[PDB]
Design a protein around this nucleic acid. Structure first.
Ligand SMILES: [Mg+2]
Ligand SMILES: [Mg+2]
Ligand SMILES: [Mg+2]
Ligand SMILES: [Mg+2]
Ligand SMILES: [Mg+2]
Ligand SMILES: [Mg+2]
Ligand SMILES: [Mg+2]
Ligand SMILES: [Mg+2]
Ligand SMILES: [Mg+2]
Ligand SMILES: [Mg+2]
Ligand SMILES: [Mg+2]
Ligand SMILES: [Mg+2]
Ligand SMILES: [Mg+2]
Ligand SMILES: [Mg+2]
Ligand SMILES: [Mg+2]
Ligand SMILES: [Mg+2]
Ligand SMILES: [Mg+2]
Ligand SMILES: [Mg+2]
Ligand SMILES: [Mg+2]
Ligand SMILES: [Mg+2]
Ligand SMILES: [Mg+2]
Ligand SMILES: [Mg+2]
Ligand SMILES: [Mg+2]
Ligand SMILES: [Mg+2]
Ligand SMILES: [Mg+2]
Ligand SMILES: [Mg+2]
Ligand SMILES: [Mg+2]
Ligand SMILES: [Mg+2]
Ligand SMILES: [Mg+2]
Ligand SMILES: [Mg+2]
Ligand SMILES: [Mg+2]
Ligand SMILES: [Mg+2]
Ligand SMILES: [Mg+2]
Ligand SMILES: [Mg+2]
Ligand SMILES: [Mg+2]
Ligand SMILES: [Mg+2]
Ligand SMILES: [Mg+2]
Ligand SMILES: [Mg+2]
Ligand SMILES: [Mg+2]
Ligand SMILES: [Mg+2]
Ligand SMILES: [Mg+2]
Ligand SMILES: [Mg+2]
Ligand SMILES: [Mg+2]
Ligand SMILES: [Mg+2]
Ligand SMILES: [Mg+2]
Ligand SMILES: [Mg+2]
Ligand SMILES: [Mg+2]
Ligand SMILES: [Mg+2]
Ligand SMILES: [Mg+2]
Ligand SMILES: [Mg+2]
Ligand SMILES: [Mg+2]
Ligand SMILES: [Mg+2]
Ligand SMILES: [Mg+2]
Ligand SMILES: [Mg+2]
Ligand SMILES: [Mg+2]
Ligand SMILES: [Mg+2]
Ligand SMILES: [Mg+2]
Ligand SMILES: [Mg+2]
Ligand SMILES: [Mg+2]
Ligand SMILES: [Mg+2]
Ligand SMILES: [Mg+2]
Ligand SMILES: [Mg+2]
Ligand SMILES: [Mg+2]
Ligand SMILES: [Mg+2]
Ligand SMILES: [Mg+2]
Ligand SMILES: [Mg+2]
Ligand SMILES: [Mg+2]
Ligand SMILES: [Mg+2]
Ligand SMILES: [Mg+2]
Ligand SMILES: [Mg+2]
Ligand SMILES: [Mg+2]
Ligand SMILES: [Mg+2]
Ligand SMILES: [Mg+2]
Ligand SMILES: [Mg+2]
Ligand SMILES: [Mg+2]
Ligand SMILES: [Mg+2]
Ligand SMILES: [Mg+2]
Ligand SMILES: [Mg+2]
Ligand SMILES: [Mg+2]
Ligand SMILES: [Mg+2]
Ligand SMILES: [Mg+2]
Ligand SMILES: [Mg+2]
Ligand SMILES: [Zn+2]
Lengths: 99, 122, 151, 138, 208
RNA sequence: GUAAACUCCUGAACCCGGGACGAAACCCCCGAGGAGGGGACUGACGGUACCGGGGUAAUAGCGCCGGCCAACUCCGUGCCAGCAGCCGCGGUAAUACGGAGGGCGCGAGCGUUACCCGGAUUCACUGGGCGUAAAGGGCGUGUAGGCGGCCUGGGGCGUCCCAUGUG
RNA sequence: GGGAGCAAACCGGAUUAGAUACCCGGGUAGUCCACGCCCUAAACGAUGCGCGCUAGGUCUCUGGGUCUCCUGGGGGCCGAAGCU
């Protein structure tokens, strides 16, 4: 079946495209403790409908572009900027590193 | 260290270094004598040890102990290098292999002949 | 009556003007090879005597051991402060896989099939004391449901 | 704030029994009880019952002990020899059935919350399930 | 190869009558009845307190020497004993006893386990009619360990039967001196063998 | 050291004769060139394996022998000659050097060098520690992350079970 | 900026085989103030922070309650269990 997963939109800049951030939980293969990692997929939004802060389902799909190999299946909710917070601040901190 | 710490930093591997840069991990290495000579040992002992410096195929240059009584190594004796530190002498990392090349065996020896390239006497 | 086998005999030594005077330790294990077992460390100005003392001190301190077909009721981990030993039950046809010190114990204890290992320190004298203290806390099914009965 | 109420209680119990307390309390918890009821039904504790301390709901666990002992240090043997939290909050522990712990050759219990409820090692393998290995006792 | 070197020197090592000769070992000596002490110029001095190693070692020295077998084939069996589900200690021995060069000895066609090997490798034996010269042959239950047809008439073969007359034989075995054959009935239990070795030590030694 | 010598027995080698399995299909006739049946040719290894017959007692070597590690004495040597994996041995009384006698361990092998895992629980999840042994940040504020009290309900992601495909 | 006392460096006296030191007589940065850096230490309880749990005896600081005692929060010593 076409793989599918949900995630928060966190980039509306591109034309007819959006960025979805998706988390997944799994136990450390030697230290048990369940851990979370994340990834950003380039979703195809032909109707320019979905906006920032959206939680959505995306689907493994025909290659739209170099990085776009998914399409926005359907919305899940709008108010979710709280997550966009943590993601942006994460990118905020990188400043305070490189010298 | 908390499990989280282990999930982050993780336990470091060990990693060890080779007491013998005979290189290529080769079990042996042919070389050619250049300076055969006698040397005094370290602290608790005293005796004139017979060593020989040897230029390897590895472009190197190393001292090597010559085991057993008496030998026949000159300034150009090619000879097979074995590897095995001598604790008595500083800087000796390798034994020379008796019985191979210009490395003549030990004359007269009867016991442990194998370790000194001695043929079975009639 | 029982059985005798020494674990070690060391020659400690004290200082004193003119020179040093010595002594002799002696750790001995004792058992009927069926359940009764005891260990005694004995120290005397002389070896034979000291061994003899360990003999008495040994036959003194005893302990019944809940054997079972030759193995043990259940595995145990016992840390005698510094040293640590772990005993584990093993199906017959195995053997006495143990260090020297804990072997002489279990062998003169009727025990035959058991898995062991020494961790932390490994000082004979302490591994010894650790093995005794180990055996003590062994409890049989009857021993268990006896206390867990509460009636 | 107290991180893990569960291992706390097991400790209240532990620290208590080493001094031979009659019984000691512990904050009220529906899930905390199941551990007790199982600990009692298996005969490690006499039982328990809700109480109230200045409004605060608690759970009085009545400790069980062995008979007196002969010789030096008439220390009465312990019933609860060894209680120990397994699945800790910082490192969860979830076990299937075909590898569920076998504590001290059956001579020991091993609790574990499951999709059916709080069951013991043997009682869990009864229905043939698995879940968060709460802890082991013996 | 076997201990082609002197044999009676081995008995003198465990202070135990190791039966590996034949007529002589029941004479006034397996070499024993006159020299109950180890070979070499020393030996008959005050013996040394044997270490845990010394013992467990030499226990294994007996069991092997008893069957005149090589360390190679030997430990291969012990290990194999470890594989199959059962009491490795005794199981070993049974496998060790299922040796053809040894069954012929137990059936008494041969004065010793060594003479037995020679007769066997010489094909003078046969299982279920078919010939066999492999002294290592794993003897199965129900197998007929018979003396080869052209072999029966031999004198040495007869003499060993003229001694196996009436006198009993292994409880896991049946003689039949009339047909000059025999039979492997069942793998021996611990007791059915009376080897001077505590098999538990031999296991222990195999752990180093 | 029953070791040998010696007596007896068996008979690797070598000789004599026989001598394959691996190969039934393409192909040929009947029937239809089909399904079904019957018939024939083809073997590098190979005169090989194996069988029967006759038949000679017919290669043993290497490591070790102070402790770990187990197998002891004699002599030569004299901090020289040499040993050595660690601890160490030898400076005229060495079971530690060399030879010998003897002994232990292996055996058509025995030792050596190299490299990997073990031992090493010595990177410790299983399974380690930080007052003085190596190890708490000089002290705070706080970002991300990690973690989180008591009661009820919905969802069922983690977790658990069954089935099936896959492995 | 300020500089009384003290005082590395420096000078002299003495001591000593020597005495760039301990002792003595002098003595300058500095020690003090403003503002700006430096960011180390046996920055030691050589003991990271928080929460619960597990005898007591005694001295002391601080708060509440009618008070030869009970109840909080600190500073010490001895010591249950336990740890080492
Ligand atoms: Mg593109
Ligand atoms: Mg495009
Ligand atoms: Mg840079
Ligand atoms: Mg390095
Ligand atoms: Mg070497
Ligand atoms: Mg060559
Ligand atoms: Mg030759
Ligand atoms: Mg204690
Ligand atoms: Mg714990
Ligand atoms: Mg041989
Ligand atoms: Mg079984
Ligand atoms: Mg003979
Ligand atoms: Mg001989
Ligand atoms: Mg004749
Ligand atoms: Mg013939
Ligand atoms: Mg022909
Ligand atoms: Mg054919
Ligand atoms: Mg054919
Ligand atoms: Mg065909
Ligand atoms: Mg036709
Ligand atoms: Mg037909
Ligand atoms: Mg044909
Ligand atoms: Mg034909
Ligand atoms: Mg042919
Ligand atoms: Mg061919
Ligand atoms: Mg023939
Ligand atoms: Mg003939
Ligand atoms: Mg012949
Ligand atoms: Mg011969
Ligand atoms: Mg040979
Ligand atoms: Mg060899
Ligand atoms: Mg060796
Ligand atoms: Mg030696
Ligand atoms: Mg003499
Ligand atoms: Mg001599
Ligand atoms: Mg002489
Ligand atoms: Mg010298
Ligand atoms: Mg040597
Ligand atoms: Mg000396
Ligand atoms: Mg001498
Ligand atoms: Mg040596
Ligand atoms: Mg000679
Ligand atoms: Mg010899
Ligand atoms: Mg061998
Ligand atoms: Mg080797
Ligand atoms: Mg190497
Ligand atoms: Mg390694
Ligand atoms: Mg370490
Ligand atoms: Mg290391
Ligand atoms: Mg360092
Ligand atoms: Mg320190
Ligand atoms: Mg600090
Ligand atoms: Mg800090
Ligand atoms: Mg800092
Ligand atoms: Mg719910
Ligand atoms: Mg799962
Ligand atoms: Mg499946
Ligand atoms: Mg000024
Ligand atoms: Mg100024
Ligand atoms: Mg002044
Ligand atoms: Mg001054
Ligand atoms: Mg001046
Ligand atoms: Mg001067
Ligand atoms: Mg000066
Ligand atoms: Mg001056
Ligand atoms: Mg100057
Ligand atoms: Mg001065
Ligand atoms: Mg002075
Ligand atoms: Mg001034
Ligand atoms: Mg300056
Ligand atoms: Mg100033
Ligand atoms: Mg000032
Ligand atoms: Mg001022
Ligand atoms: Mg600045
Ligand atoms: Mg500062
Ligand atoms: Mg301080
Ligand atoms: Mg603190
Ligand atoms: Mg108050
Ligand atoms: Mg008053
Ligand atoms: Mg109070
Ligand atoms: Mg205060
Ligand atoms: Mg206080
Ligand atoms: Zn004999």
């Amino acid at each position: 079946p076409k793989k599918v997963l949900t995630g928060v939109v966190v980039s509306d800049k591109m034309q007819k495209t959006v960025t979805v951030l998706v988390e997944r939980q799994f136990p450390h293969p030697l230290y048990g403790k369940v851990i979370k990692r994340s990834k950003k997929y380039l979703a195809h939004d032909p109707e320019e409908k979905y906006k920032l802060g959206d939680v959505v389902e995306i689907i493994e799909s025909r290659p739209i572009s170099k990085r776009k190999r998914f399409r926005v299946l359907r919305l899940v909710e709008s108010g979710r900027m709280d997550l966009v917070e943590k993601y942006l601040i994460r990118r905020q901190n990188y400043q305070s590193l490189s010298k | 260290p908390t499990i989280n710490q282990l999930v982050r930093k993780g336990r470091e591997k060990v990693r060890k270094k080779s007491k013998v840069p005979a290189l290529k991990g080769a079990p042996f290495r042919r070389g050619v004598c250049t300076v055969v000579r006698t040397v005094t040992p370290k602290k608790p002992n005293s005796a004139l040890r017979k060593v020989a410096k040897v230029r390897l195929t590895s472009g190197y240059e190393v001292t090597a102990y010559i085991p057993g009584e008496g030998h026949n190594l000159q300034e150009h004796s090619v000879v097979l290098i074995r590897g095995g530190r001598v604790k008595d002498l500083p800087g000796v990392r390798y034994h020379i292999v008796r019985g191979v090349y210009d490395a003549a065996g030990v004359k007269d020896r009867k016991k442990s002949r194998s370790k000194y390239g001695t043929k079975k006497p009639k | 009556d029982f059985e005798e086998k020494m674990i070690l005999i060391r020659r400690t030594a004290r200082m004193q003007a003119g020179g040093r005077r010595f002594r002799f330790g002696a750790l001995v294990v004792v058992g009927d090879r069926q359940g009764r077992v005891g260990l005694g460390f004995g120290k005397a100005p002389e070896v034979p005597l000291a061994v003899q003392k360990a003999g008495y001190y040994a036959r003194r301190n005893m302990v019944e051991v809940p054997l079972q077909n030759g193995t043990i009721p259940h595995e145990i981990e016992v840390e005698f402060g510094a040293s640590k030993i772990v005993l584990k039950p093993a199906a017959p046809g195995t053997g006495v896989i143990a260090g020297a010190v804990p072997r002489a114990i279990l062998e003169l204890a009727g025990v035959t099939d058991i898995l062991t290992k020494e961790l932390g320190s490994r000082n004979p004298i302490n591994i010894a004391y650790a093995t005794m203290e180990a055996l003590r806390q062994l409890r049989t099914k009857a021993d268990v449901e006896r206390l867990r009965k509460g009636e | 704030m107290l991180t893990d109420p569960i291992a706390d209680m097991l400790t209240r119990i532990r620290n208590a029994t080493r001094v031979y307390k009659e019984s000691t309390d512990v904050p009220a918890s529906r899930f905390k009880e199941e551990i007790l009821r199982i600990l009692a039904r298996e005969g490690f504790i006499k039982g328990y019952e809700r109480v109230d301390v200045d409004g605060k709901p608690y759970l009085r666990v009545y400790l069980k002990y062995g008979p007196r002992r002969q010789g030096p240090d008439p220390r009465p043997e312990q019933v609860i020899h060894h209680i120990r939290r397994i699945s800790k909050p910082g490192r969860r522990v979830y076990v299937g059935v075909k590898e569920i712990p076998r504590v001290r050759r059956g001579l020991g219990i091993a609790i574990l919350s499951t999709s059916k409820g709080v069951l013991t090692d043997r009682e869990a393998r009864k229905l043939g399930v698995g879940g968060e290995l709460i802890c082991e006792v013996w | 190869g076997r201990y082609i070197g002197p044999v009676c020197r081995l008995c003198r090592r465990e202070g135990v009558k190791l039966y590996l000769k034949g007529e002589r070992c029941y004479s006034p000596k397996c070499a024993m009845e006159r020299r109950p002490y180890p070979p070499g110029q020393h030996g008959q001095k005050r013996a040394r307190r044997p270490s845990d190693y010394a013992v467990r070692l030499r226990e294994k020295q007996k069991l092997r020497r008893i069957y005149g077998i090589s360390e190679r084939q030997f430990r291969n069996l012990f290990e194999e004993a470890s594989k199959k589900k059962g009491v490795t200690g005794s199981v070993f021995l049974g496998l060790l006893e299922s040796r053809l060069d040894n069954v012929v000895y137990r059936l008494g066609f041969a004065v010793s386990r060594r003479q037995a090997r020679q007769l066997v490798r010489h094909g003078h034996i046969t299982v279920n009619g078919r010939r066999v010269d492999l002294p290592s042959y794993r003897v199965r239950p129900g197998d007929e360990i018979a003396v080869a047809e052209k072999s029966r008439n031999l004198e040495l073969i007869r003499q060993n039967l003229e001694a196996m007359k009436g006198r009993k034989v292994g409880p896991w075995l049946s003689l039949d001196v009339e047909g000059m054959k025999g039979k492997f009935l069942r793998l021996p239990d611990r007791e059915d063998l009376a080897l001077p070795v505590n098999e538990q030590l031999v296991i222990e030694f195999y752990s180093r």
